[PDB]
Protein backbone atom coordinates (compact mmCIF):
# COMPACT_ATOMS: atom_id res chain seq x y z
CA UNK A 1 0.00 0.00 0.00
CA UNK A 2 0.99 3.64 -0.46
CA UNK A 3 -0.22 7.15 0.32
CA UNK A 4 -2.78 8.74 -2.01
CA UNK A 5 -3.73 12.41 -2.35
CA UNK A 6 -6.43 12.72 -5.05
CA UNK A 7 -9.41 11.10 -6.72
CA UNK A 8 -7.20 10.22 -9.71
CA UNK A 9 -7.41 6.58 -10.74
CA UNK A 10 -3.62 6.26 -10.47
CA UNK A 11 -0.99 8.61 -8.98
CA UNK A 12 0.03 9.54 -12.53
CA UNK A 13 -1.83 9.34 -15.84
CA UNK A 14 -0.54 9.38 -19.42
CA UNK A 15 -2.92 10.99 -21.88
CA UNK A 16 -2.46 9.94 -25.50
CA UNK A 17 -4.30 11.23 -28.54
CA UNK A 18 -2.54 14.41 -29.55
CA UNK A 19 -0.26 14.35 -32.58
CA UNK A 20 0.75 18.00 -32.55
CA UNK A 21 3.24 19.56 -30.15
CA UNK A 22 1.14 20.59 -27.15
CA UNK A 23 1.79 24.28 -26.39
CA UNK A 24 -0.84 25.02 -23.73
CA UNK A 25 -3.11 23.44 -21.17
CA UNK A 26 -5.38 24.60 -18.38
CA UNK A 27 -7.99 23.28 -15.97
CA UNK A 28 -11.57 24.44 -15.73
CA UNK A 29 -12.00 26.40 -12.46
CA UNK A 30 -14.65 23.88 -11.35
CA UNK A 31 -12.05 21.11 -11.57
CA UNK A 32 -14.18 18.82 -13.73
CA UNK A 33 -12.25 19.21 -16.98
CA UNK A 34 -9.01 20.31 -18.60
CA UNK A 35 -8.36 21.59 -22.11
CA UNK A 36 -5.09 21.32 -24.00
CA UNK A 37 -3.92 22.38 -27.43
CA UNK A 38 -0.99 23.31 -29.60
CA UNK A 39 0.35 22.68 -33.07
CA UNK A 40 -2.45 20.17 -33.76
CA UNK A 41 -4.89 23.16 -33.60
CA UNK A 42 -7.58 20.75 -32.29
CA UNK A 43 -8.41 21.67 -28.67
CA UNK A 44 -8.82 18.46 -26.66
CA UNK A 45 -11.00 18.42 -23.56
CA UNK A 46 -10.33 15.74 -20.94
CA UNK A 47 -12.11 14.75 -17.76
CA UNK A 48 -9.92 15.04 -14.69
CA UNK A 49 -11.23 11.84 -13.06
CA UNK A 50 -11.69 8.15 -13.69
CA UNK A 51 -10.76 7.13 -17.22
CA UNK A 52 -10.19 10.87 -18.01
CA UNK A 53 -11.72 10.22 -21.41
CA UNK A 54 -11.36 12.77 -24.22
CA UNK A 55 -15.06 13.54 -24.14
CA UNK A 56 -14.83 16.55 -26.48
CA UNK A 57 -12.59 17.98 -29.17
CA UNK A 58 -12.99 21.39 -30.82
CA UNK A 59 -11.54 22.14 -34.26
CA UNK A 60 -12.04 25.60 -35.86
CA UNK A 61 -8.51 26.86 -35.28
CA UNK A 62 -6.38 26.87 -38.43
CA UNK A 63 -3.23 28.37 -36.94
CA UNK A 64 -1.56 26.61 -34.01
CA UNK A 65 -2.82 27.62 -30.57
CA UNK A 66 -0.41 29.59 -28.40
CA UNK A 67 -2.37 29.79 -25.15
CA UNK A 68 -5.72 28.87 -23.76
CA UNK A 69 -7.48 29.95 -20.56
CA UNK A 70 -10.88 29.38 -19.02
CA UNK A 71 -13.19 32.19 -18.03
CA UNK A 72 -13.68 32.38 -14.27
CA UNK A 73 -17.29 31.14 -14.34
CA UNK A 74 -16.18 28.23 -16.62
CA UNK A 75 -18.92 29.16 -19.10
CA UNK A 76 -16.40 29.80 -21.88
CA UNK A 77 -12.85 28.94 -22.92
CA UNK A 78 -10.72 31.70 -24.48
CA UNK A 79 -7.90 30.63 -26.77
CA UNK A 80 -5.64 32.35 -29.28
CA UNK A 81 -3.36 31.13 -32.00
CA UNK A 82 -1.11 31.98 -34.89
CA UNK A 83 -4.18 32.51 -37.14
CA UNK A 84 -4.04 36.14 -35.85
CA UNK A 85 -7.42 35.54 -34.14
CA UNK A 86 -8.77 35.30 -30.58
CA UNK A 87 -11.59 32.75 -30.34
CA UNK A 88 -13.98 32.26 -27.40
CA UNK A 89 -15.64 28.84 -27.14
CA UNK A 90 -18.94 28.25 -25.39
CA UNK A 91 -18.44 25.26 -23.12
CA UNK A 92 -21.98 23.89 -23.38
CA UNK A 93 -22.32 24.39 -27.13
CA UNK A 94 -18.72 23.82 -28.14
CA UNK A 95 -18.95 26.69 -30.61
CA UNK A 96 -17.19 29.98 -31.26
CA UNK A 97 -19.05 32.64 -29.32
CA UNK A 98 -16.67 35.34 -30.56
CA UNK A 99 -13.81 35.42 -33.09
CA UNK A 100 -11.86 38.62 -32.50
CA UNK A 101 -9.93 39.40 -35.65
CA UNK A 102 -8.27 42.83 -35.36
CA UNK A 103 -4.73 41.57 -34.71
CA UNK A 104 -2.35 41.95 -37.65
CA UNK A 105 0.17 39.27 -36.58
CA UNK A 106 0.28 36.09 -34.48
CA UNK A 107 -1.52 36.28 -31.14
CA UNK A 108 0.58 34.69 -28.42
CA UNK A 109 -1.01 34.85 -25.04
CA UNK A 110 -4.50 35.41 -23.63
CA UNK A 111 -6.08 36.17 -20.27
CA UNK A 112 -9.77 36.72 -19.40
CA UNK A 113 -10.99 39.23 -16.85
CA UNK A 114 -11.73 37.70 -13.47
CA UNK A 115 -15.00 39.53 -12.73
CA UNK A 116 -17.34 42.16 -14.09
CA UNK A 117 -17.76 42.34 -17.85
CA UNK A 118 -15.89 39.58 -19.67
CA UNK A 119 -12.76 41.16 -21.17
CA UNK A 120 -9.93 39.35 -22.98
CA UNK A 121 -6.42 40.77 -22.81
CA UNK A 122 -4.22 39.62 -25.67
CA UNK A 123 -0.65 40.21 -26.83
CA UNK A 124 0.79 39.71 -30.28
CA UNK A 125 3.80 39.80 -32.63
CA UNK A 126 2.44 43.08 -33.99
CA UNK A 127 3.52 44.73 -30.74
CA UNK A 128 0.01 45.64 -29.66
CA UNK A 129 -1.60 44.69 -26.38
CA UNK A 130 -5.35 44.71 -27.01
CA UNK A 131 -8.32 44.28 -24.70
CA UNK A 132 -11.44 42.96 -26.42
CA UNK A 133 -14.98 43.06 -25.09
CA UNK A 134 -17.58 40.41 -25.85
CA UNK A 135 -20.14 43.08 -26.74
CA UNK A 136 -18.23 44.90 -29.53
CA UNK A 137 -16.46 44.10 -32.79
CA UNK A 138 -13.84 46.80 -32.15
CA UNK A 139 -11.50 46.37 -29.14
CA UNK A 140 -11.78 48.62 -26.12
CA UNK A 141 -8.05 49.37 -25.86
CA UNK A 142 -5.09 48.94 -28.19
CA UNK A 143 -1.72 49.69 -26.59
CA UNK A 144 1.06 49.71 -29.17
CA UNK A 145 4.68 48.84 -28.43
CA UNK A 146 7.68 49.02 -30.75
CA UNK A 147 8.57 45.35 -29.95
CA UNK A 148 6.54 42.15 -30.07
CA UNK A 149 4.62 41.17 -26.94
CA UNK A 150 4.48 37.50 -25.95
CA UNK A 151 2.82 37.36 -22.56
CA UNK A 152 -0.21 39.13 -21.09
CA UNK A 153 -2.34 39.26 -17.94
CA UNK A 154 -4.80 41.51 -16.18
CA UNK A 155 -4.42 42.39 -12.55
CA UNK A 156 -7.11 41.02 -10.25
CA UNK A 157 -9.25 44.18 -10.45
CA UNK A 158 -9.06 43.91 -14.29
CA UNK A 159 -7.97 47.54 -14.70
CA UNK A 160 -4.22 47.14 -15.24
CA UNK A 161 -2.93 45.01 -18.11
CA UNK A 162 0.58 43.61 -17.73
CA UNK A 163 2.30 42.70 -21.01
CA UNK A 164 5.84 41.42 -21.50
CA UNK A 165 7.79 40.80 -24.68
CA UNK A 166 10.99 40.99 -26.66
CA UNK A 167 11.97 44.06 -24.62
CA UNK A 168 12.59 41.87 -21.51
CA UNK A 169 11.36 44.89 -19.54
CA UNK A 170 7.58 45.04 -19.10
CA UNK A 171 5.03 47.50 -20.45
CA UNK A 172 2.39 47.59 -17.71
CA UNK A 173 -0.55 49.72 -18.78
CA UNK A 174 -3.24 51.15 -16.51
CA UNK A 175 -6.62 51.17 -18.27
CA UNK A 176 -7.80 54.54 -16.87
CA UNK A 177 -4.56 56.33 -17.83
CA UNK A 178 -3.62 54.53 -21.06
CA UNK A 179 -0.03 55.03 -19.93
CA UNK A 180 2.68 52.83 -18.56
CA UNK A 181 2.44 53.37 -14.82
CA UNK A 182 5.65 51.45 -14.09
CA UNK A 183 7.99 48.91 -15.64
CA UNK A 184 9.46 45.78 -14.05
CA UNK A 185 13.18 45.41 -14.76
CA UNK A 186 15.28 42.27 -14.21
CA UNK A 187 14.67 40.01 -17.22
CA UNK A 188 17.72 39.61 -19.45
CA UNK A 189 15.84 37.82 -22.28
CA UNK A 190 12.31 37.66 -23.69
CA UNK A 191 9.37 36.90 -21.40
CA UNK A 192 7.80 33.54 -22.24
CA UNK A 193 4.86 33.79 -19.84
CA UNK A 194 3.15 35.76 -17.07
CA UNK A 195 0.65 34.44 -14.53
CA UNK A 196 -1.29 36.43 -11.95
CA UNK A 197 -1.39 35.21 -8.37
CA UNK A 198 -4.78 33.94 -7.08
CA UNK A 199 -4.94 36.87 -4.66
CA UNK A 200 -3.60 39.27 -7.30
CA UNK A 201 -0.82 40.71 -5.17
CA UNK A 202 1.98 39.14 -7.22
CA UNK A 203 2.82 37.99 -10.71
CA UNK A 204 5.45 35.49 -11.76
CA UNK A 205 7.09 35.99 -15.14
CA UNK A 206 9.14 33.39 -16.97
CA UNK A 207 11.86 34.34 -19.41
CA UNK A 208 14.29 32.81 -21.86
CA UNK A 209 17.20 33.68 -19.51
CA UNK A 210 16.15 30.47 -17.56
CA UNK A 211 14.79 32.36 -14.51
CA UNK A 212 11.29 33.01 -13.11
CA UNK A 213 11.04 36.39 -11.37
CA UNK A 214 8.34 37.20 -8.82
CA UNK A 215 6.98 40.76 -8.88
CA UNK A 216 4.78 42.66 -6.44
CA UNK A 217 2.07 44.46 -8.43
CA UNK A 218 0.21 45.88 -5.41
CA UNK A 219 -0.47 49.65 -5.74
CA UNK A 220 2.12 50.70 -3.09
CA UNK A 221 5.55 49.08 -2.70
CA UNK A 222 8.24 51.18 -0.92
CA UNK A 223 11.20 49.92 -3.00
CA UNK A 224 12.08 47.56 -5.79
CA UNK A 225 9.21 45.23 -6.74
CA UNK A 226 11.46 42.24 -7.37
CA UNK A 227 10.55 39.76 -4.63
CA UNK A 228 12.68 36.84 -5.75
CA UNK A 229 14.19 34.82 -8.55
CA UNK A 230 13.75 31.12 -9.22
CA UNK A 231 16.12 29.00 -11.26
CA UNK A 232 16.74 25.40 -12.20
CA UNK A 233 14.54 25.18 -15.24
CA UNK A 234 15.98 25.78 -18.70
CA UNK A 235 14.96 27.19 -22.08
CA UNK A 236 16.43 25.38 -25.10
CA UNK A 237 17.11 26.45 -28.69
CA UNK A 238 13.42 25.90 -29.54
CA UNK A 239 12.78 29.32 -27.93
CA UNK A 240 9.30 28.17 -26.91
CA UNK A 241 6.96 30.44 -24.98
CA UNK A 242 7.12 28.18 -21.93
CA UNK A 243 4.24 29.23 -19.64
CA UNK A 244 4.01 29.53 -15.85
CA UNK A 245 1.29 29.06 -13.24
CA UNK A 246 0.46 29.55 -9.57
CA UNK A 247 -0.77 27.07 -7.04
CA UNK A 248 -4.22 28.17 -5.77
CA UNK A 249 -2.74 28.34 -2.25
CA UNK A 250 0.14 30.51 -3.64
CA UNK A 251 2.72 28.47 -1.71
CA UNK A 252 3.92 26.90 -5.00
CA UNK A 253 4.97 28.20 -8.40
CA UNK A 254 5.61 26.28 -11.63
CA UNK A 255 7.10 27.02 -15.00
CA UNK A 256 7.61 25.16 -18.22
CA UNK A 257 11.11 23.85 -18.80
CA UNK A 258 13.00 22.56 -21.82
CA UNK A 259 14.83 19.92 -19.71
CA UNK A 260 11.63 17.74 -19.55
CA UNK A 261 11.36 18.21 -15.77
CA UNK A 262 8.25 19.57 -14.06
CA UNK A 263 9.60 22.17 -11.66
CA UNK A 264 7.80 23.37 -8.53
CA UNK A 265 9.28 26.10 -6.31
CA UNK A 266 8.46 27.20 -2.77
CA UNK A 267 7.48 30.87 -3.03
CA UNK A 268 9.45 32.23 -0.03
CA UNK A 269 12.70 30.28 -0.16
CA UNK A 270 12.86 29.94 -3.98
CA UNK A 271 14.12 26.40 -3.50
CA UNK A 272 12.85 23.55 -5.61
CA UNK A 273 10.87 20.85 -4.09
CA UNK A 274 9.38 18.82 -6.81
CA UNK A 275 11.40 17.81 -9.91
CA UNK A 276 9.26 15.33 -11.63
CA UNK A 277 10.53 13.37 -14.68
CA UNK A 278 8.38 11.49 -17.22
CA UNK A 279 8.26 13.82 -20.21
CA UNK A 280 10.34 13.17 -23.32
CA UNK A 281 10.57 16.76 -24.55
CA UNK A 282 10.10 20.45 -23.76
CA UNK A 283 7.39 20.94 -21.12
CA UNK A 284 5.63 23.92 -22.66
CA UNK A 285 2.90 24.41 -20.03
CA UNK A 286 2.20 23.52 -16.41
CA UNK A 287 -0.84 24.18 -14.22
CA UNK A 288 -2.36 23.17 -10.88
CA UNK A 289 -5.84 21.76 -10.47
CA UNK A 290 -7.77 24.49 -8.60
CA UNK A 291 -9.17 22.33 -5.75
CA UNK A 292 -7.01 19.20 -5.52
CA UNK A 293 -3.23 18.63 -5.61
CA UNK A 294 -3.11 17.43 -9.24
CA UNK A 295 -0.35 18.71 -11.53
CA UNK A 296 -1.00 19.16 -15.25
CA UNK A 297 1.91 19.35 -17.64
CA UNK A 298 1.85 19.61 -21.42
CA UNK A 299 4.95 18.96 -23.48
CA UNK A 300 6.41 18.95 -26.96
CA UNK A 301 6.40 15.13 -26.65
CA UNK A 302 2.71 15.07 -27.74
CA UNK A 303 1.78 13.83 -24.22
CA UNK A 304 -0.21 15.34 -21.36
CA UNK A 305 0.67 14.21 -17.84
CA UNK A 306 -1.65 14.34 -14.85
CA UNK A 307 -0.19 13.45 -11.49
CA UNK A 308 -0.88 14.05 -7.83
CA UNK A 309 1.54 15.57 -5.34
CA UNK A 310 2.00 16.24 -1.64
CA UNK A 311 1.41 19.97 -1.65
CA UNK A 312 2.53 20.62 1.92
CA UNK B 1 -5.01 28.78 29.60
CA UNK B 2 -1.60 27.19 30.03
CA UNK B 3 -0.09 27.13 26.53
CA UNK B 4 3.65 26.69 27.13
CA UNK B 5 5.57 24.65 24.56
CA UNK B 6 8.98 23.98 26.15
CA UNK B 7 10.67 22.67 22.96
CA UNK B 8 9.68 25.87 21.09
CA UNK B 9 9.96 28.43 23.91
CA UNK B 10 13.70 27.78 24.16
CA UNK B 11 14.54 31.39 25.09
CA UNK B 12 13.20 30.74 28.61
CA UNK B 13 15.96 31.04 31.22
CA UNK B 14 16.38 30.64 34.98
CA UNK B 15 16.52 34.44 35.18
CA UNK B 16 13.06 34.48 33.60
CA UNK B 17 11.99 31.74 36.01
CA UNK B 18 12.93 33.96 38.94
CA UNK B 19 11.01 36.84 37.37
CA UNK B 20 7.92 34.70 36.68
CA UNK B 21 7.66 33.31 40.22
CA UNK B 22 8.08 36.84 41.57
CA UNK B 23 4.85 37.74 39.78
CA UNK B 24 3.18 34.65 41.28
CA UNK B 25 4.57 35.75 44.67
CA UNK B 26 2.84 39.12 44.37
CA UNK B 27 -0.30 37.21 43.40
CA UNK B 28 -0.19 34.70 46.24
CA UNK B 29 0.50 37.52 48.69
CA UNK B 30 -3.21 38.21 48.06
CA UNK B 31 -4.43 35.04 46.37
CA UNK B 32 -5.08 32.53 49.20
CA UNK B 33 -5.55 28.66 49.31
CA UNK B 34 -9.20 28.88 50.20
CA UNK B 35 -10.92 26.28 48.00
CA UNK B 36 -10.73 22.57 48.71
CA UNK B 37 -8.48 21.61 45.82
CA UNK B 38 -8.80 17.88 46.68
CA UNK B 39 -12.53 17.43 45.95
CA UNK B 40 -11.68 15.27 42.92
CA UNK B 41 -9.97 12.77 45.29
CA UNK B 42 -12.04 10.86 47.89
CA UNK B 43 -11.93 11.56 51.61
CA UNK B 44 -9.17 9.33 53.06
CA UNK B 45 -10.05 6.14 54.88
CA UNK B 46 -6.98 5.39 57.01
CA UNK B 47 -8.86 2.88 59.25
CA UNK B 48 -10.51 0.80 56.52
CA UNK B 49 -10.41 -3.00 57.05
CA UNK B 50 -8.63 -2.74 60.43
CA UNK B 51 -9.90 -4.63 63.46
CA UNK B 52 -10.63 -3.13 66.86
CA UNK B 53 -7.33 -4.73 67.91
CA UNK B 54 -5.22 -3.25 65.12
CA UNK B 55 -6.64 0.24 65.72
CA UNK B 56 -4.89 0.14 69.10
CA UNK B 57 -1.70 -1.02 67.37
CA UNK B 58 -2.03 2.02 65.10
CA UNK B 59 -2.63 4.30 68.09
CA UNK B 60 0.53 3.22 69.94
CA UNK B 61 2.81 3.99 66.98
CA UNK B 62 0.80 7.13 66.24
CA UNK B 63 1.74 7.97 69.86
CA UNK B 64 5.29 6.73 69.11
CA UNK B 65 5.01 4.30 72.00
CA UNK B 66 7.70 1.63 71.91
CA UNK B 67 6.84 -1.84 70.61
CA UNK B 68 6.57 -4.54 73.24
CA UNK B 69 9.07 -7.40 73.04
CA UNK B 70 9.04 -11.03 74.11
CA UNK B 71 11.32 -11.91 77.02
CA UNK B 72 13.66 -14.44 75.39
CA UNK B 73 15.71 -15.04 78.58
CA UNK B 74 14.00 -18.47 78.82
CA UNK B 75 16.56 -19.76 76.31
CA UNK B 76 19.41 -18.81 78.68
CA UNK B 77 17.49 -20.29 81.68
CA UNK B 78 18.35 -18.04 84.66
CA UNK B 79 19.46 -20.19 87.56
CA UNK B 80 17.38 -20.43 90.77
CA UNK B 81 18.95 -20.35 94.22
CA UNK B 82 18.16 -22.11 97.49
CA UNK B 83 17.10 -18.88 99.21
CA UNK B 84 14.39 -18.60 96.51
CA UNK B 85 13.95 -22.36 95.84
CA UNK B 86 11.73 -22.81 98.92
CA UNK B 87 8.71 -22.24 96.63
CA UNK B 88 7.63 -25.16 94.43
CA UNK B 89 6.51 -22.67 91.77
CA UNK B 90 10.11 -21.61 91.08
CA UNK B 91 11.32 -25.18 90.48
CA UNK B 92 8.11 -26.05 88.62
CA UNK B 93 8.88 -23.08 86.38
CA UNK B 94 12.61 -23.79 86.06
CA UNK B 95 12.51 -27.57 85.55
CA UNK B 96 9.61 -27.55 83.10
CA UNK B 97 11.41 -24.83 81.17
CA UNK B 98 14.59 -26.93 81.22
CA UNK B 99 12.61 -29.84 79.77
CA UNK B 100 11.07 -27.59 77.11
CA UNK B 101 14.41 -26.07 76.06
CA UNK B 102 15.89 -29.56 75.62
CA UNK B 103 13.33 -30.26 72.86
CA UNK B 104 13.78 -26.87 71.19
CA UNK B 105 17.48 -27.66 70.99
CA UNK B 106 16.70 -31.18 69.76
CA UNK B 107 14.44 -29.86 67.00
CA UNK B 108 17.11 -27.26 66.24
CA UNK B 109 19.64 -30.06 65.73
CA UNK B 110 17.32 -31.92 63.34
CA UNK B 111 16.61 -28.69 61.45
CA UNK B 112 20.30 -27.78 61.25
CA UNK B 113 21.25 -31.25 60.01
CA UNK B 114 18.57 -31.05 57.33
CA UNK B 115 19.61 -27.48 56.60
CA UNK B 116 23.16 -28.74 56.03
CA UNK B 117 21.89 -31.10 53.32
CA UNK B 118 19.59 -28.74 51.42
CA UNK B 119 20.22 -25.08 52.25
CA UNK B 120 23.22 -24.74 49.95
CA UNK B 121 21.08 -25.84 46.98
CA UNK B 122 17.86 -24.04 47.88
CA UNK B 123 19.75 -20.81 48.49
CA UNK B 124 21.31 -21.23 45.05
CA UNK B 125 17.82 -21.95 43.71
CA UNK B 126 16.54 -18.83 45.48
CA UNK B 127 19.35 -16.68 44.04
CA UNK B 128 18.65 -17.95 40.51
CA UNK B 129 14.99 -16.91 40.78
CA UNK B 130 16.11 -13.60 42.29
CA UNK B 131 18.46 -13.04 39.34
CA UNK B 132 15.57 -13.83 37.00
CA UNK B 133 13.45 -11.18 38.73
CA UNK B 134 16.21 -8.57 38.53
CA UNK B 135 16.94 -9.13 34.84
CA UNK B 136 13.21 -9.04 34.08
CA UNK B 137 12.94 -5.80 36.07
CA UNK B 138 15.96 -4.34 34.26
CA UNK B 139 14.30 -5.36 31.00
CA UNK B 140 11.23 -3.41 32.12
CA UNK B 141 13.42 -0.46 33.17
CA UNK B 142 15.09 -0.31 29.75
CA UNK B 143 11.74 -0.60 27.96
CA UNK B 144 10.10 2.21 29.96
CA UNK B 145 13.12 4.53 29.70
CA UNK B 146 12.86 4.21 25.92
CA UNK B 147 9.11 4.87 26.12
CA UNK B 148 9.71 8.02 28.22
CA UNK B 149 12.28 9.29 25.72
CA UNK B 150 9.88 8.63 22.84
CA UNK B 151 7.26 10.91 24.43
CA UNK B 152 9.89 13.65 24.64
CA UNK B 153 10.68 13.07 20.97
CA UNK B 154 7.01 13.09 19.95
CA UNK B 155 6.47 16.32 21.89
CA UNK B 156 9.61 17.89 20.42
CA UNK B 157 8.63 16.77 16.92
CA UNK B 158 5.09 18.16 17.19
CA UNK B 159 6.13 21.42 18.87
CA UNK B 160 8.99 22.17 16.48
CA UNK B 161 6.94 21.23 13.42
CA UNK B 162 4.32 23.74 14.57
CA UNK B 163 7.05 26.08 15.80
CA UNK B 164 8.48 26.76 12.36
CA UNK B 165 5.00 27.62 11.11
CA UNK B 166 4.55 29.97 14.08
CA UNK B 167 7.86 31.65 13.25
CA UNK B 168 6.86 32.13 9.61
CA UNK B 169 3.43 33.59 10.45
CA UNK B 170 4.75 35.85 13.23
CA UNK B 171 7.44 37.30 10.97
CA UNK B 172 4.76 37.78 8.31
CA UNK B 173 2.34 39.46 10.75
CA UNK B 174 4.73 42.12 12.06
CA UNK B 175 5.64 43.01 8.48
CA UNK B 176 1.98 43.63 7.63
CA UNK B 177 1.29 45.74 10.72
CA UNK B 178 4.26 47.99 9.95
CA UNK B 179 3.25 48.12 6.28
CA UNK B 180 -0.41 48.90 7.00
CA UNK B 181 0.42 51.79 9.32
CA UNK B 182 2.74 53.09 6.59
CA UNK B 183 -0.21 52.95 4.18
CA UNK B 184 -2.30 54.91 6.69
CA UNK B 185 0.28 57.71 6.61
CA UNK B 186 0.51 57.49 2.82
CA UNK B 187 -3.25 57.73 2.25
CA UNK B 188 -3.42 60.77 4.52
CA UNK B 189 -0.46 62.23 2.62
CA UNK B 190 -2.25 61.83 -0.72
CA UNK B 191 -5.14 63.78 0.87
CA UNK B 192 -2.94 66.73 -0.19
CA UNK B 193 -5.07 66.35 -3.36
CA UNK B 194 -7.37 68.75 -1.49
CA UNK B 195 -4.71 71.36 -2.27
CA UNK B 196 -4.93 70.56 -5.99
CA UNK B 197 -8.72 70.59 -6.00
CA UNK B 198 -8.92 73.93 -4.18
CA UNK B 199 -6.33 75.34 -6.59
CA UNK B 200 -8.24 73.75 -9.47
CA UNK B 201 -11.51 75.23 -8.22
CA UNK B 202 -10.00 78.70 -7.61
CA UNK B 203 -7.55 78.83 -10.51
CA UNK C 1 1.07 13.71 49.47
CA UNK C 2 -2.39 15.22 49.88
CA UNK C 3 -0.87 18.17 51.73
CA UNK C 4 1.65 18.81 48.96
CA UNK C 5 -0.95 18.35 46.20
CA UNK C 6 -3.17 21.01 47.78
CA UNK C 7 -0.24 23.41 47.83
CA UNK C 8 0.74 22.49 44.27
CA UNK C 9 -2.78 23.06 42.92
CA UNK C 10 -2.96 26.32 44.87
CA UNK C 11 0.26 27.54 43.26
CA UNK C 12 -0.94 26.46 39.82
CA UNK C 13 -4.27 28.22 40.34
CA UNK C 14 -2.49 31.39 41.45
CA UNK C 15 -0.32 31.08 38.34
CA UNK C 16 -3.41 30.96 36.13
CA UNK C 17 -4.47 34.31 37.56
CA UNK C 18 -1.15 35.79 36.44
CA UNK C 19 -1.53 34.13 33.02
CA UNK C 20 -5.03 35.59 32.60
CA UNK C 21 -3.99 39.11 33.61
CA UNK C 22 -0.91 39.06 31.36
CA UNK C 23 -2.81 37.51 28.44
CA UNK C 24 -5.25 40.43 28.48
CA UNK C 25 -2.44 42.98 28.62
CA UNK C 26 -0.91 41.31 25.57
CA UNK C 27 -4.24 41.28 23.72
CA UNK C 28 -4.76 45.00 24.35
CA UNK C 29 -1.23 45.71 23.16
CA UNK C 30 -1.67 43.63 20.01
CA UNK C 31 -5.06 45.24 19.42
CA UNK C 32 -3.43 48.68 19.54
CA UNK C 33 -0.94 47.52 16.92
CA UNK C 34 -3.61 45.88 14.75
CA UNK C 35 -5.69 49.12 14.67
CA UNK C 36 -2.82 51.62 14.82
CA UNK C 37 -3.76 54.81 12.91
CA UNK C 38 -1.91 58.13 13.01
CA UNK C 39 -7.46 63.48 54.17
CA UNK C 40 -9.97 60.91 52.83
CA UNK C 41 -7.53 58.05 53.48
CA UNK C 42 -6.64 59.43 56.93
CA UNK C 43 -10.32 59.74 57.87
CA UNK C 44 -10.98 56.09 57.00
CA UNK C 45 -8.15 54.76 59.20
CA UNK C 46 -9.17 57.16 61.91
CA UNK C 47 -12.77 56.02 61.51
CA UNK C 48 -11.87 52.32 61.06
CA UNK C 49 -9.59 52.30 64.12
CA UNK C 50 -12.40 54.00 66.00
CA UNK C 51 -14.83 51.43 64.67
CA UNK C 52 -12.56 48.44 65.31
CA UNK C 53 -11.50 49.71 68.77
CA UNK C 54 -15.03 50.41 70.02
CA UNK C 55 -15.78 46.79 69.05
CA UNK C 56 -13.21 45.42 71.50
CA UNK C 57 -15.44 45.70 74.58
CA UNK C 58 -18.24 43.96 72.65
CA UNK C 59 -15.74 41.30 71.63
CA UNK C 60 -14.76 40.72 75.25
CA UNK C 61 -18.37 40.52 76.49
CA UNK C 62 -21.59 39.91 74.59
CA UNK C 63 -24.78 41.72 75.67
CA UNK C 64 -26.53 40.13 78.64
CA UNK C 65 -29.87 40.55 76.83
CA UNK C 66 -28.82 38.21 74.02
CA UNK C 67 -31.49 35.67 73.13
CA UNK C 68 -30.49 32.15 74.14
CA UNK C 69 -30.03 29.22 71.77
CA UNK C 70 -32.87 27.47 73.61
CA UNK C 71 -35.11 30.44 72.79
CA UNK C 72 -34.13 30.60 69.10
CA UNK C 73 -34.93 26.88 68.92
CA UNK C 74 -38.61 27.88 69.49
CA UNK C 75 -38.91 30.50 66.70
Amino acid sequence: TAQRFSNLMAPTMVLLGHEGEIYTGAFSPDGTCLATSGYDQKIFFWNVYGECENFSTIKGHSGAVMDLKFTTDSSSLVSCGTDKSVRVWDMETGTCARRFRTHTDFVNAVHPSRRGVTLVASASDDGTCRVHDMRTKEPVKTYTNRYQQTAVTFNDSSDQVISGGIDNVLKVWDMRRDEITYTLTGHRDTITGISLSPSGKFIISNSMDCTVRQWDIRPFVPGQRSVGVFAGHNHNFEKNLLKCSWSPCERFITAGSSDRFLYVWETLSKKIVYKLPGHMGSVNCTDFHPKEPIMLSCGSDKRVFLGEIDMS
Amino acid sequence: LVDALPYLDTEYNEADRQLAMKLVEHECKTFRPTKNYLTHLPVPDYDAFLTKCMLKEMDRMKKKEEMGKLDMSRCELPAPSAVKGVDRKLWAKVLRNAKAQNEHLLMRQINLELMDEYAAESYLQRNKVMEDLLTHAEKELRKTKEAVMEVHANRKMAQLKAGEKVKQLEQSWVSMVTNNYRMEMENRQIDSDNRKQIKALKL
Amino acid sequence: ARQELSHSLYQHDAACRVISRLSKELTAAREALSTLKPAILAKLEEKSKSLTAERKQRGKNLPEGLAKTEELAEL
Binding site: - | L169, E170, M176, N180, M183, N187, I190, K196 | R30, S34
Partner: peptide
Protein backbone atom coordinates in the same frame (compact mmCIF):
# COMPACT_ATOMS: atom_id res chain seq x y z
CA UNK D 1 -1.69 29.06 15.83
CA UNK D 2 -5.39 29.94 15.87
CA UNK D 3 -4.53 33.26 17.48
CA UNK D 4 -1.95 34.08 14.80
CA UNK D 5 -4.11 32.93 11.88
CA UNK D 6 -6.86 35.28 13.03
CA UNK D 7 -4.33 38.06 13.62
CA UNK D 8 -2.88 37.53 10.14
CA UNK D 9 -6.33 37.42 8.52
CA UNK D 10 -7.36 40.66 10.25
CA UNK D 11 -4.42 42.37 8.56
CA UNK D 12 -4.95 40.62 5.21
CA UNK D 13 -8.37 42.27 5.00
CA UNK D 14 -7.05 45.55 6.38
CA UNK D 15 -4.38 45.85 3.70
CA UNK D 16 -6.85 45.20 0.87
CA UNK D 17 -9.08 48.01 2.12
CA UNK D 18 -6.09 50.35 2.46
CA UNK D 19 -4.83 49.52 -1.04
CA UNK D 20 -8.26 50.17 -2.54
CA UNK D 21 -8.03 53.54 -0.82
CA UNK D 22 -4.54 54.08 -2.22
CA UNK D 23 -5.68 53.20 -5.73
CA UNK D 24 -8.74 55.44 -5.40
CA UNK D 25 -6.61 58.25 -3.99
CA UNK D 26 -3.60 57.93 -6.29
CA UNK D 27 -5.94 57.66 -9.28
CA UNK D 28 -7.41 61.02 -8.21
CA UNK D 29 -4.00 62.67 -8.01
CA UNK D 30 -3.36 61.74 -11.64
Amino acid sequence: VGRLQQEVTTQETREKDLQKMYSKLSNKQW
